């Protein structure tokens, strides 16, 4: 495991303006995204190869409440003038939302939860995983970015609660997901300084990785149908070439919601909607910004009548059907944008307790649609249907009788405002908890869990070596080709995958 330490910015001396033409040019391999899955592959591709990771934000230097757990709220706080590291969105649910939009991508901006995926997880894909490389690639990660935490007073009670509720056994302290408590592994460090996506450019050769900020990818050029490039904007707005050569790639790393996006505008996506928007069909899919999925995140908040010391998400309780954590959180007047689903949401006048559920799957899906069929900085529409598959909606119930379990819990006892039997003891924040009056609570207040996933999956737009069907030379790696989660908290894994999938590149090539 990593140590206590500065975020390491020592790749910044590879780091470029994409305003400088002299970047343009042949590479072996061009990363679009310098995000969760896009930096460690770019790092990893850069051990034997000439590489250009474009990334549209700027350095994390940039927005200093990035690098620490202090800092968490202030990047949800602050308002989205284009250029700030969370970008805002609302899905056509109503559900408000973010993603990153910094190089380090949403490991720059995320809760700091770190867990291995779900070891059943590679036979249930299918894929001819080389298990024993996963493993490699998730220590690689693990020593340069990932601690075990210190202890943390809330994390303690939750834990205990989470046992006494019959969340068991006690995994004590492990990164795997498996059913139980357990405290899992943090990218914040025991100082609270953030680590990042970002430091594992600092395992690339600097002799080989080239790095653009502000580098907006626009387009991906085509030639045996083949990637051969992309056209990507700088901040002033000029445009700018890079090509790939010889037996080399274009690598799609732009997220859940980039990736689809830059798919269809450069003609690879259903026939009949890119006809529809008079976009040149290059390569027909019927799949592309199909199947996009959000993990609803159910949640009561709890206003104890002392306060109680905030603290980062490290205590998980796993069962297959929940995957339930709780944040202690100090008092706002400014609201975190999508930690509730709405702006229309009360502020808290005291520290809380957010206690949350998380639906695995899920089953509901959506799609990306273009917005602008020109412009990539126009964001797409998204929809991701919560709760249309009414599995996911069974399973919510679930998780929110276990929260009542929770709250029912000695552990949890001494957070009540009255010591009477029942939790209408506690205070609440926002709608208490009540079969269908828990379906009502579930419709009615879900949130996102900020792990979305989907629109390039394995099986419908790519094969199991994460390769655009049809297209040589174009692979997509990041969190749009899964249609399940791997686990509660997917950042470890979409890591673990960018060096993966990079190694699997090389292999490929020698
Ligand atoms: C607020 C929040 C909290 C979270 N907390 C946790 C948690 O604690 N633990 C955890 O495991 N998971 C967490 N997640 C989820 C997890 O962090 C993400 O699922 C994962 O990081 C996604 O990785 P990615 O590589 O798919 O996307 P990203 O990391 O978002 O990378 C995509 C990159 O592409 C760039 N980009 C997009 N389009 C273009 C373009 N056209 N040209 C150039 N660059 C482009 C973006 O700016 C970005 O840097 C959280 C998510 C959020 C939003
Ligand atoms: C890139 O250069 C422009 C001036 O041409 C400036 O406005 C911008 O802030 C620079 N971006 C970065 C990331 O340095
Ligand atoms: C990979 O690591 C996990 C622990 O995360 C372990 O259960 C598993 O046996 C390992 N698998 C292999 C193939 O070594
Ligand atoms: C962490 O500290 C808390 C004190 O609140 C203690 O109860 C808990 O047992 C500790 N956990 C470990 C694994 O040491
Ligand atoms: C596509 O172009 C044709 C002209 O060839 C026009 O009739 C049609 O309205 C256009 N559709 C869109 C959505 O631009
Ligand atoms: C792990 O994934 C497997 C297969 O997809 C599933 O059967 C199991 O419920 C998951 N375990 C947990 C604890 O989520
Ligand atoms: C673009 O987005 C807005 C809301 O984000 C939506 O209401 C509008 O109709 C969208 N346009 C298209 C063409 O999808
Ligand atoms: C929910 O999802 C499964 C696919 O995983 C499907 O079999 C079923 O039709 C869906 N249920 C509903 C209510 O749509
Ligand atoms: C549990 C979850 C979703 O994650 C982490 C988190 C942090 C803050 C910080 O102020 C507030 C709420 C919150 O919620």
Same mark, same amino acid.
């Given at each position: 495991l990593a140590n206590t330490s500065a975020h390491d910015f020592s790749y910044l001396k590879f780091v470029y303006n994409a305003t400088d033409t002299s970047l343009e040019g042949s590479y072996d391999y061009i990363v679009i995204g310098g995000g969760t899955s896009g930096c460690p592959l770019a790092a990893t591709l850069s051990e034997k190869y000439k590489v250009l990771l474009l990334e549209r934000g700027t350095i994390a230097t940039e927005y200093p409440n990035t690098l620490t757990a202090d800092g968490f709220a202030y990047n949800l706080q602050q308002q989205d003038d284009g250029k700030t590291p969370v970008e805002r969105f609302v899905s056509e649910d109503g559900?408000?939302?973010?993603?990153?939009?910094?190089?380090?991508?949403?490991?720059?901006?995320?809760?700091?939860?770190?867990?291995?995926?779900?070891?059943?997880?590679?036979?249930?894909?299918?894929?001819?995983?080389?298990?024993?490389? @996963?493993? $490699?690639?998730?220590?690689?990660?693990?020593? %340069? *970015?990932? #601690?075990?935490?210190?202890?943390?007073?809330?994390? &303690?009670?939750?834990?205990?609660?989470?046992?006494?509720?019959?969340?068991?056994?006690?995994?004590?302290?492990?990164?795997?997901?498996?059913?139980?408590?357990?405290?899992?592994?943090?990218?914040?460090?025991?100082?609270?300084?953030?680590?990042?996506?970002?430091?594992?450019?600092?395992?690339?050769?600097?002799?080989?990785?080239?790095?653009?900020?502000?580098?907006? @990818?626009? $387009?991906?050029?085509?030639?045996?149908?083949? %990637? *051969?490039? #992309?056209?990507?904007?700088?901040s002033?707005?000029? &445009?700018?070439?890079?090509?790939?050569?010889?037996?080399?790639?274009?690598?799609?790393?732009?997220?859940?919601?980039?990736?689809?996006?830059?798919?269809?505008?450069?003609?690879?996506?259903?026939?009949?909607?890119?006809?529809?928007?008079?976009?040149?069909?290059?390569?027909?899919?019927?799949?592309?910004?199909?199947?996009?999925?959000?993990?609803?995140?159910?949640?009561?908040?709890?206003?104890?009548?002392?306060?109680?010391? %905030?603290?980062? #998400?490290?205590?998980?309780?796993?069962?297959?059907?929940?995957?339930?954590?709780?944040?202690?959180?100090?008092?706002?007047?400014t609201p975190l944008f999508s930690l509730f689903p709405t702006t229309s949401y009360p502020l808290p006048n005291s520290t809380f307790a957010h206690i949350v559920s998380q639906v695995p799957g899920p089953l509901s899906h959506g799609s990306v649609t273009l917005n602008s069929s020109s412009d990539v900085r126009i964001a797409p529409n998204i929809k991701f249907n919560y709760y249309s598959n009414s599995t996911d909606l069974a399973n919510c119930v679930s998780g929110m009788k276990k929260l009542g379990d929770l709250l029912r819990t000695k552990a949890l006892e001494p957070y009540k405002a009255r010591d009477v039997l029942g939790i209408d003891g506690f205070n609440y924040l926002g709608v208490p908890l009540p079969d269908a009056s828990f379906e009502t609570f579930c419709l009615d207040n879900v949130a996102s869990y900020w792990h979305y996933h989907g629109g390039s999956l394995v099986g419908k737009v790519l094969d199991d070596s994460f390769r655009v069907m049809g297209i040589k030379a174009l692979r997509v790696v990041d969190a749009s080709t899964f249609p399940y989660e791997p686990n509660s908290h997917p950042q470890g894994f979409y890591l673990m995958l960018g060096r993966y999938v990079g190694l699997q590149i090389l292999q490929e090539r020698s």
């Open positions: 559900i408000d939302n973010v993603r990153a939009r910094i190089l380090g991508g949403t490991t720059i901006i995320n809760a700091g939860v770190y867990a291995r995926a779900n070891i059943s997880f590679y036979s249930q894909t299918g894929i001819e995983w080389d298990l024993d490389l @996963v493993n $490699k690639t998730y220590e690689w990660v693990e020593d %340069a *970015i990932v #601690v075990k935490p210190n202890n943390q007073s809330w994390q &303690s009670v939750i834990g205990e609660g989470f046992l006494e509720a019959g969340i068991l056994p006690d995994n004590g302290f492990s990164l795997d997901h498996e059913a139980g408590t357990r405290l899992t592994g943090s990218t914040f460090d025991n100082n609270g300084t953030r680590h990042a996506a970002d430091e594992l450019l600092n395992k690339g050769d600097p002799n080989n990785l080239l790095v653009a900020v502000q580098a907006s @990818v626009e $387009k991906i050029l085509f030639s045996n149908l083949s %990637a *051969i490039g #992309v056209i990507y904007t700088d002033d707005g000029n &445009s700018h070439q890079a090509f790939v050569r010889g037996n080399g790639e274009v690598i799609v790393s732009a997220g859940t919601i980039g990736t689809p996006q830059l798919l269809l505008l450069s003609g690879v996506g259903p026939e009949s909607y890119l006809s529809s928007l008079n976009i040149t069909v290059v390569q027909p899919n019927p799949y592309v910004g199909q199947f996009v999925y959000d993990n609803p995140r159910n949640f009561i908040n709890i206003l104890p009548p002392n306060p109680i010391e %905030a603290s980062v #998400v490290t205590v998980l309780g796993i069962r297959s059907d929940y995957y339930q954590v709780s944040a202690s959180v100090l008092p706002f007047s």
